[PDB]
């Protein structure tokens, strides 16, 4: 984790908290020490102490896979990681408890479209802030190169053909 990105971690957490506060003021949520959902009372105005931070916690984790692994490519890869971590915890806990089978125990190329969009939403939400701050990220002529490779292959084949015709 870079020092500059670690600096922006807190500010992006505050901006996501501001967006969620803005949604919850659209809903109607007033601060109150008592924990409830039917009374519309929560002590950080339904996000509890740890649940106000549960979505900030994996931002640094996305940073680690970002550095360890164009914009659409990073988006789909981050969505894949976001669903894979949840699938890992789900499979681990179901193997521990001996529970039932979850229809998300399938590779990511088979999931339903809504299951991809659910984590694609969070992926784009975190990526827009990296984009506005100027962080040029990739995954980490083409036709002319392909033609050149084809020509090289043809040269090899021609060498082989010359060797064959010599015989």
Swiss-Prot record:
Coiled-coil boundaries: none
Repeat positions for Sequence: 70-140
Gene knockout outcome: Embryonically lethal. Embryos die at about 10 dpc, due to defects in heart tube development. Cardiac myotubes display enlarged rough endoplasmic reticulum and cytoplasmic vesicles that contain high levels of Ca(2+).
Compartment(s) of residence: Sarcoplasmic reticulum membrane
Post-translational modifications: Channel activity is modulated by phosphorylation. Phosphorylation is increased in failing heart, leading to calcium leaks and increased cytoplasmic Ca(2+) levels.
Tissue: Highly expressed in heart, lung, cerebellum and brain. Detected at lower levels in adrenal gland, stomach, thymus, esophagus and ovary.
Record family assignment: Belongs to the ryanodine receptor (TC 1.A.3.1) family. RYR2 subfamily.
Function: Cytosolic calcium-activated calcium channel that mediates the release of Ca(2+) from the sarcoplasmic reticulum into the cytosol and thereby plays a key role in triggering cardiac muscle contraction. Aberrant channel activation can lead to cardiac arrhythmia. In cardiac myocytes, calcium release is triggered by increased Ca(2+) cytosolic levels due to activation of the L-type calcium channel CACNA1C. The calcium channel activity is modulated by formation of heterotetramers with RYR3. Required for cellular calcium ion homeostasis. Required for embryonic heart development.
Entry remark concerning the domains of this protein: The calcium release channel activity resides in the C-terminal region while the remaining part of the protein resides in the cytoplasm.
Record text on subunit structure and interactions: Homotetramer. Can also form heterotetramers with RYR1 and RYR3. Interacts with CALM and S100A1; these interactions regulate channel activity. Identified in a complex composed of RYR2, FKBP1B, PKA catalytic subunit, PRKAR2A, AKAP6, and the protein phosphatases PP2A and PP1. Interacts directly with FKBP1B, PKA, PP1 and PP2A. Interacts with FKBP1A and FKBP1B; these interactions may stabilize the channel in its closed state and prevent Ca(2+) leaks. Interacts with SELENON. Identified in a complex, composed of FSD2, CMYA5 and RYR2.
Protein name as annotated: Ryanodine receptor 2
Taxonomic source organism: Mus musculus (Mouse)
